[PDB]
Amino acid sequence: NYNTVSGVNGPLVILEKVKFPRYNEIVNLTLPDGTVRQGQVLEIRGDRAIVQVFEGTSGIDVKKTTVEFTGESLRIPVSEDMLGRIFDGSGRPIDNGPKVFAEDYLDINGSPINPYARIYPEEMISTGVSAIDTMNSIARGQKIPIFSASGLPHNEIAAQICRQAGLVRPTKENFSIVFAAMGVNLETARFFKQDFEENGSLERTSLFLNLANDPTIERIITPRLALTTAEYLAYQTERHVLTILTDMSSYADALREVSAAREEVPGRRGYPGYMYTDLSTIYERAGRVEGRNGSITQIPILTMPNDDITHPIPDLTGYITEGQIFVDRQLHNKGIYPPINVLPSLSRLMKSAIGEGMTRKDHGDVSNQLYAKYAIGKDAAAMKAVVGEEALSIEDKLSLEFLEKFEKTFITQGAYEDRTVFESLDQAWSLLRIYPKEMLNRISPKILDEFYD
Amino acid sequence: LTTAEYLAYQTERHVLTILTDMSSYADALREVSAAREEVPGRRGYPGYMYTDLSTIYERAGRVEGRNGSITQIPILTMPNDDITHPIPDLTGYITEGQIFVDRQLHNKGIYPPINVLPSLSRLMKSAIGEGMTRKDHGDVSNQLYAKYAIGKDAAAMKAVVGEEALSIEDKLSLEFLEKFEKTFITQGAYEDRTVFESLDQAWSLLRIYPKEMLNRISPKILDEFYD
Amino acid sequence: FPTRMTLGLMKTKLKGANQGYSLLKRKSEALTKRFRDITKRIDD
Amino acid sequence: AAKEIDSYKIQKDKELKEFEQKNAGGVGELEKKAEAGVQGELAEIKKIAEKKKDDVVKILIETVIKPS
Amino acid sequence: EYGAIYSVSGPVVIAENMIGCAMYELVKVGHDNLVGEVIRIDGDKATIQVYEETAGLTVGDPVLRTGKPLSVELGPGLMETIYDGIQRPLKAIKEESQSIYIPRGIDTPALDRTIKWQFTPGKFQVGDHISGGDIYGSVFENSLISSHKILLPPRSRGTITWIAPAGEYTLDEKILEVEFDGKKSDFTLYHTWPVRVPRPVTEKLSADYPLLTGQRVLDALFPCVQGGTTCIPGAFGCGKTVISQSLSKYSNSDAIIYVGCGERGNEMAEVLMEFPELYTEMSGTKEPIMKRTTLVANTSNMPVAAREASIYTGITLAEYFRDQGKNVSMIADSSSRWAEALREISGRLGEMPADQGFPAYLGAKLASFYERAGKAVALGSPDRTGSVSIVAAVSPAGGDFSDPVTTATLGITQVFWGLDKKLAQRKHFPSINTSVSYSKYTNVLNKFYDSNYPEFPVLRDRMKEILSNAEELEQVVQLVGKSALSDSDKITLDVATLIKEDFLQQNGYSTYDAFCPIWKTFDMMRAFISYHDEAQKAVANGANWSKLADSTGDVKHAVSSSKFFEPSRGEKEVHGEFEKLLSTMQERFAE
Amino acid sequence: GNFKSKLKKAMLSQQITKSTIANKMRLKVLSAREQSLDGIFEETKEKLSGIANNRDEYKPILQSLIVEALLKLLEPKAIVKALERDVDLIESMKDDIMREYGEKAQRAPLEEIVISNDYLNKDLVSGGVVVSNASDKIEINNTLEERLKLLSEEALPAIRLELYG
């Protein structure tokens, strides 16, 4: 324990008379007021060391402060008792329970899956949503994000997804998920809490809650703890691990804040240059392990700033994660059920859960045909809104009515309403019947004769 | 500023401040800020410039218990004929209202080219009325502004389909606009007109239009004015 | 491509297109009224 | 037609109240058994507390000379 | 350790022997003891940033450090006192110094220590276990609200020994002696709490308690519950001051905390002059509105540190009043000035800007300020319930919503009510855009209002859909024509015009139209819905639109008078009129 | 329909009450297990308190701990803080401590050992030592309570792995 400190500038700390410091090492900071704040080591040069304070450097004496260095790297108290119990962003229990007994102490940074040991996404799952089935399939163990906008029903959609996940999946051992929030709103926290309570999955799931009132360091460290927890659940516990993370934008802005506070060289849009790799850290952690049962399925949730799909956040998210589910504000003001844009939203591998032997061979072709009819309907909608209603051909109006029906019926179901995959395929088969016989060029003759009543 | 302050709080007298070329003072303050070798902000300007202007325009106002009042009317030239300049944006939200200049009217060989559209004052409500200037001030002001605006729209319309499509209120607004531009707007370099003469000229110029041509005027005022 | 001058030209073209849109709108209204009166006159 | 409707409504209300009563009874019984299960778990945890009391004696004895 | 400045660069001054001082700590620089704030600390020499003029400060002048951060004094004597961004009285400065200007380096107390108050122990005796937030007594401050509860200051837990209550004492006198684990300790009626640290509470809760705006449209369309957060435009000349004053006066909250950032001198002077003119309407007439409220005013000439942190101090005071278990409200005018001051502070801190000249901590500070409000239970034995209703105004430079301040305001605040200058130029009541109005608090507010079976939500959503249909009908009216529509469209248009006149428009100048009661608004919406339903039923009954409009004119004239006639004690008088509307239906079933 | 909605709401309240009761049961189980762990820690603390009651056995342990602390110091002059009861014992062991320090590291001889006049509280500290440098910038905790509390982190997992499998 070193009581020696030299300088203080902004939200950081620098100490001397120390040696052999470890990168991102756990360090206990005892202030003059008796306040104990946890911190991590930043860099070490010669006999001098520099670290960043999580709780802030506000109200701390230079010569009256003591510091204890563990020397070990970042360590989290992972266990099998975390299920059903809620934890905060700092690791402390938010459930007001007693001391949690750690089964194992492991680095929250997480270990990248070896390429040869990495197994490809397989099987399938039922999300209860038609768009999460027909338009864009969701594999079990794969990783896909969700792009929403501020003011939109992102929390409601996430709640519906989390509630209908394990419910619909059984129609394909219950599915276990993990809830994680970093620097989010108290209202959204209450909504998410009521959502997890209503879903009743809170007993079989774990929760990491980092309030916006709390520091940025804790919020950024919450994702690491959740990653280590999900990893321990998908490896040591050998169970199916679903990853639900929210408010990534706050963590991003906080990351940019930390990058700017250290006067580091910023990347695009004032963000960090390592931001891509920083996101890719927890992005590439998802996948399947050969020889090991269970898998970690990443279902992140982010909000594009000012409803801009061209924002660096969404760009880097797509550059990190493979595939995403976009939520447009255009259909959010329509009053219809949750606004998923079929065009922008896509899955990395939709061909893995398709074909015969899994569900049906009529899935993929119908998806391509429906996407084609929808896109053609959109272009025809633009043309109709441009020139006029009498300036458009028959196929234009047909695809327009087909897309409108697809939005009003197929796209609009409900939050508490979980549509079965069979119901989705049936509704899609009924949706294709609205279009003409020569309308869909992406469909085969056999499937066309089979689906048409 | 100190000179105006000494003649206000101490000497207790009415004072008026006028600043010319605030942009040159902005470049001067930029050099002064660069003298400290500080890293400049957007477009090479200090981030504390807002406070610098806040330490300037705040020297004007009325003091409670003091008869003497100090008023300030600064002036700044917009760079490259653009209102997007940081200076204008700084004085915009700070000061109340702004007096712009139309380069077209200045190139039209006329008197001072202050665009009535852009010209506005937030304290203009307290500078008019009975006991201040006149009860016919604000109403005729808004009516004249409306006449100039609608006259401009009618000017654009007449430049499209021609003067044969000119309507009643359209032609009236056209004549009113041309007149106000060639009479009301034009004053002079050394020319100084009284508020009474201004209101009289306003009513005389508005006399070209009928009694029902002004919807911005009140019945009592119109009855107590027109004669 | 991304220059202040290009932004100025684009903005000027935008404003001109706006004024032109208003003018074309009013002209469309006048033409509509004229064609309506001429239509009633055509029926008569 | 009105009497049968009111009778069916009264029957539905009675069935609803019966459902709420069943829920109350079930909740009571479950809450009654939960304490017993927790008691037994506390007993097993007590035996484990004795075994780990001996184990704590050994662990402390081992941790005493640890300071080398 | 006493500091000595070894360097002076502009407003910034670095002083050696400052090792005793800490980071982000206030300090008195020079012999004039000018107000300053410590930015960084290097060894024994700390770098401090003076918020005042650095002129007059020389070398050799001893610099005294406060030894702590920026704080404020919560307790008696705080109410009915105007303050600045530095929390100092202007009126007392004009009374003492007898000058129209404020000298650099001058300092004055926030609460008057020369004011004697009569205090008495309410629910605290000797030997009882108490903690921080627990009321140790009550002292009467204002002439309106009940005696201000003096509570045991934070981080203090122990048994009371010697109580100086009851009796007459000032704010500088210790009214109690508490015995903690640290043995003997002293406690007074006045306390000091950090401006950057929100007031401690027992438990956090969600706010189901609706706050009365007094306005019809405000309570109907975009209702803000007590503890809730709402935002609006900062456009000048749009009549925002009237809406703000009316909201503050008709509020159901106990106290009101107004914290300004910066603005023109004329506006600040107008607000300051119109502030004390307001009178209460609870117990007939108590004291002025300034007595049960707190005001913090900072002009453009004020420091940036006294601007961006002014909201923190105001929220600290509001939470301090909320720590006594009373519902309060925090009003913020021109927050964009505080944002620009935060940008200048970012430039002064050397922090690299993020976007459009915004700081790195922008979103964090905004979220921190937005999370300070809400309804909760304060700490201490008292266990009193309280709330803080956040209200902010944004006045962007360019007016674009793409600005960081606008996005942060819309993001943090769950309720956003736009103010359109054209709507105020429409010769109508207070300006609000019906199209851009939205709130996410509608659900909880509806579920909570259903307890008293006062349900706006049904009629609210109905009138919303009706407004949408009327909007489409308006778009069609500007497309084809108003005479080409059907009977339902015409009835919808007439109902839309009627709702925008006798319903949405409420004159704050009148007596009965100033504050619209919950029962009044509910009965108004009910009568309107009854009229619309009667018209829709008569439309399907085979009755002509002209004959109906001619016969039902009396019903419209009677319904138009439902905004007046004062007190709603006989609200049933309106219900009869609704029955008359049904008779109007019977009149449509005859002719 | 309304009756079905109300019944669904009541059943939802019943399921919520059941989930809350289950959460209370799980919390009770966790609190019981934590009470068992804290009980084992209490018995271990009792055994540690009983082991600290023997001066003859703790003497050599104190010497070895002081030597190990000095090995983690390697400072020319070492300041040591100890309990009032261990003051005389450490004072008499000063020569033995210097000899043991010289034997441990011959590349870094011990010039002087300064004994602090401030003794640890008898109630707060039941035993152990406190090592520090001449400048008192860095300090190592040889205290028994601190050592046990710090060891408990990695010990809990091992003890649980042994006892619970």
Chain A meets chain F (3+ C-beta pairs below 8 A): yes
Cβ–Cβ gap E363/A253 under 8 Å? yes
Sign of the dihedral defined by the CA atoms of residues E80, E81, E84, E86, in that order: negative
The listed CATH number (3.20.20.80, 3.30.420.10, 3.30.2320.30, 3.10.105.10) that belongs to domain F39-165: 3.30.2320.30
- Chain B neighbours (≥3 Cβ pairs under 8 A) are C, E
Query: Domain end: E187, E221, E250, which one?
Result: E187
Is residue D10 within 8 angstroms of chain F, CB to CB?
A: no
Sign of the dihedral defined by the CA atoms of residues E306, E312, E314, E320, in that order: negative
CA dihedral E327, E332, E333, E336 (to 10 degrees): -160
**∠ CA A158-A162-A165, rounded to 5°:** 130
Residues E204 and E313 in one domain: yes
How long is chain E? 591
Residues 6+ apart with CB under 8 A from B72: B4, B16, B17, B18, B19, B57, B59, B60
- The 10 Å Cβ neighbour count of residue E229 is 26
C-alpha to C-alpha distances, A417 to A156, A338, A420, nearest whole angstrom: 12, 12, 10
Give E-chain residues touching B96 at CB under 8 angstroms: 236, 264, 266-267
Closest CA to A227 of A113, A371, A369: A113
- Report the relative pairing of strands E129-130 and E158-163 from DSSP bridges: antiparallel
d(CA A364, CA B190): 83
User: Residue type for F1, please?
Assistant: G
CA neighbours within 13 Å on the CB side: how many for E148?
A: 26
Residues E302 and E401 in one domain: yes
How close does chain F come to D5, measured CA to CA in Å? 14
Is residue B157 within 8 angstroms of chain C, CB to CB?
A: yes
d(CA E217, CA E220): 5
Residues E64 and E77 in one domain: no
Q: What is the largest CA-CA distance in chain A?
A: 84
Tokens of E6: 């070894």
CB E319 within 8 A of CB E329: no
Phi and psi, residue E83, nearest 5°:
-140, 165
How close does chain F come to A360, measured CA to CA in Å? 36
d(CA C31, CA A429): 49
Q: Is E424 strand, coil or helix?
A: helix
Q: HEC states along A358-379?
A: CCCCCHHHHHHHHHHHHHHHHH
- Report the relative pairing of strands A146-149 and A104-106 from DSSP bridges: unpaired
d(CA A187, CA A180): 15
Residues E126 and E202 in one domain: no
CA dihedral A307, A309, A310, A313 (to 10 degrees): 90
- The 10 Å Cβ neighbour count of residue E95 is 9
Tokens of E523: 């009965």
Residues E179 and E205 in one domain: no
Find the closest chain F residue to A16 by CA distance: F137
Q: How many domains, chain E?
A: 4
Tokens of E75: 């307790």
- Chain A neighbours (≥3 Cβ pairs under 8 A) are E, F
**∠ CA E454-E458-E464, rounded to 5°:** 125
- Alpha helix (H) ranges present in A150-272? 154-168, 186-199, 216-235, 248-261
Residues E250 and E353 in one domain: yes
Tokens of E541: 């009954």
Neighbour-count burial for E302-340, b at 16+ CB within 10 Å, e otherwise: bbbbbbbbbbbbbbbbbbbbbbbbbbbbbbbbbbbbbbb
Query: Domain end: E35, E70, E105, which one?
Result: E70
- For A343-346, the CB contacts below 8 A with 24+ separation are A343/A371, A343/A374, A343/A375, A343/A378, A344/A147, A344/A309, A345/A131, A345/A135, A345/A136, A346/A136
Find the closest chain F residue to A100 by CA distance: F34
**∠ CA B100-E404-B23, rounded to 5°:** 30
d(CA E493, CA E472): 10
Residues E164 and E195 in one domain: no
Cβ–Cβ gap B160/C23 under 8 Å? yes
Query: Domain end: E394, E417, E439, which one?
Result: E439
- Chain D neighbours (≥3 Cβ pairs under 8 A) are F
Closest CA to E417 of E229, E247, E214, E233: E233
* Eight-class DSSP state of E210: B
How close does chain B come to E488, measured CA to CA in Å? 33
Out of A3, A98, A203, whose CB is closest to F137?
Answer: A3
d(CA E27, CA E489): 69
Is residue C30 within 8 angstroms of chain B, CB to CB?
A: yes
How long is chain F? 165
CB A51 within 8 A of CB A82: no
Chain D interface mutation, best of F25, F51, F143, highest count of D Cβ atoms under 10 Å = F25
Is residue C19 within 8 angstroms of chain B, CB to CB?
A: yes
Residue E151's domain comprises: 115-187
Give F-chain residues touching D30 at CB under 8 angstroms: 18, 21
Closest CA to E76 of E104, E110, E51, E49: E110
Give E-chain residues touching A263 at CB under 8 angstroms: 350, 352
Residues E331 and E376 in one domain: yes
Is residue F149 within 8 angstroms of chain A, CB to CB?
A: no
d(CA E212, CA A369): 54
Residues E349 and E429 in one domain: yes
Find the closest chain E residue to B83 by CA distance: E398
Residues 6+ apart with CB under 8 A from A94: A86, A87, A88, A207, A209
- For E156-159, the CB contacts below 8 A with 24+ separation are E156/E131, E156/E132, E156/E180, E156/E185, E156/E187, E157/E130, E157/E131, E157/E132, E157/E181, E158/E130, E158/E185, E159/E127, E159/E128, E159/E129, E159/E130
**∠ CA E167-E172-E174, rounded to 5°:** 55
User: To which H or E segment does residue E64 belong?
Assistant: strand E62-65
Residues E260 and E409 in one domain: yes
Residues E170 and E124 in one domain: yes
